[PDB]
Ligand binder design. Structure first.
Ligand SMILES: CN(CC(=O)N1CCCCC1)S(C)(=O)=O
Ligand SMILES: CN(CC(=O)N1CCCCC1)S(C)(=O)=O
Ligand SMILES: CN(CC(=O)N1CCCCC1)S(C)(=O)=O
Ligand SMILES: CN(CC(=O)N1CCCCC1)S(C)(=O)=O
Lengths: 265, 264
């Protein structure tokens, strides 16, 4: 993997592994999401990060994901090489965005794209805050200044507001809990585990006859390692659409909400 | 990755990923086990497998793991390159063995080793059988003929018999169940998921102060996608533990095993 010529984006190639694919012998959306995280980490390391600045470290501030949006046109097959390009962009005091483009290494065609919205949070109190001027200046040197959007479209799917699923849910998967493999190097639940939990309540008949095209996920609250989650889904719709909610098994505190769009095979 | 000069073993290099490491910023044993599976698949593909032969296909026979043994001396750090070498060997009518050696790509030092025992089974009836005459003949051309053992020591850890944990267990993790990410391309629970489930009942204080050195796991019965498992652990001692995974309801054994942990 390497930074591009101008130093404002990063590219990495991945060979899809045997355990990374589903029933169709193509990469799952969770494998894709893990590769987006990996190419994001390699980008931060390449531009000098130990992805927080010394000022953010001094203030105990971290970056946290507020929204993830992925659209896949073709999932790479087992053994295929997929090239992924990533870059960040400031969105003023609101926060920052990291975008990705996925391409088939043989054809050069775009096979997928993704975008994420990030905000600043105090790592100890968990309180949100706007991006300060001094912190913003420190990051701007690593980002393109003219807009570079993975989803440029007028009223695209990545910016649609997601409503709260009302009980009763059409489908449910209950008592889901994280194991050590679901934790990151800081003992927090990996963002990708929440995508997997959302998808646990989709009926297997949908998974067998459809392919996942779009997934948009809002992150409201972190699932702790001793938490238990319930995954809820209700059909909202040749394409099928679903509304999703992940909430704590006991009191029903919302941890995530989202939508998926599936196209018939 | 590629076959070696003689065509009897396969080597592949892997760069340890950010999500592949634990709290020590080194590869988890489940990441290691997934890389052993990956280099094993790449070996079968390189020597012409579509890892069953046309004769096995005609009989609806598959290879199934009976035992996995892994010993790690140093877990590769995030960003490190680990080289893994794998080969198979016939063990007469009993079955076959796949062995692996892990090395640090910078130093060339052996950082770990693994071995697995495999038997043939009818995929539909789930009935076991010894190597069916013409089967070992079609496989022998891909294996070294002189013994090549990852664990050569006469009667070492990889061959020790594992007893059944008696109730009550010292520690337990109950109601564990597989999600889609735990399934393979054939909708079966991935072998590596059972390693993760065995380790769920080890206390977090052990994980925080010790490193896992050895894990031996016996595979008795497959967990179906709608099954729920209980993970049981009892200290037997370095720290040593005895493990049992059984179905949450009736208590049918799915796995049993042992672990050895070294103090940091
Ligand atoms: C929101 N993602 C996290 C991410 O991109 N990263 C985490 C570490 C910083 C940059 C890379 S994801 C695909 O859900 O894992
Ligand atoms: C919000 N990002 C931080 C960021 O903008 N930067 C980090 C290094 C690349 C560009 C600058 S993230 C997704 O956490 O890496
Ligand atoms: C027993 N293992 C399976 C394995 O090595 N393989 C499966 C596919 C054929 C060869 C590779 S493991 C590391 O526990 O997944
Ligand atoms: C038991 N193995 C099959 C085998 O003997 N072989 C086929 C592939 C390489 C040559 C040898 S396994 C671990 O399932 O690949």
């Amino acid at each position: 993997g390497s930074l591009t010529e101008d130093g404002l984006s990063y590219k990495e190639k991945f060979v899809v592994r045997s355990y990374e694919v589903g029933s169709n012998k193509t990469a799952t959306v969770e494998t894709i999401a893990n590769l987006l995280q990996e190419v994001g980490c390699n980008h931060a390391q390449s531009v000098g990060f130990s992805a927080t600045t010394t000022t953010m470290r001094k203030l105990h501030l971290i970056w946290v994901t507020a929204r993830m949006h992925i659209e896949i046109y073709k999932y790479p097959a087992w053994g295929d090489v997929v090239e992924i390009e990533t870059w960040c962009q400031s969105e003023g005091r609101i926060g920052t965005r990291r975008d990705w483009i996925l391409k088939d290494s043989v054809t050069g065609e775009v096979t997928g794209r993704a975008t994420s919205k990030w905000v600043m949070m105090n790592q100890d109190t968990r309180r949100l805050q706007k991006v300060s001027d001094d912190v913003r200046d420190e990051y701007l040197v690593f980002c393109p200044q003219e807009p570079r959007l993975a989803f440029p479209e007028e009223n695209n799917r990545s910016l649609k507001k997601i409503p709260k699923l009302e009980d009763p849910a059409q489908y449910s998967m209950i008592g889901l809990k994280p194991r050590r493999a679901d934790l990151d190097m800081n003992q927090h639940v990996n963002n990708v585990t929440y995508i997997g939990w959302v998808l646990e309540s989709i009926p297997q008949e949908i998974v067998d006859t459809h392919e996942l095209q779009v997934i948009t996920l809002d992150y409201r609250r972190e699932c702790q390692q001793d938490d238990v989650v319930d995954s809820l889904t209700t059909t909202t719709s040749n394409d099928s659409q679903f509304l999703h909610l992940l909430r704590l098994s006991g009191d029903g505190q919302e941890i995530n909400r989202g939508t998926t769009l599936w196209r018939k095979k």
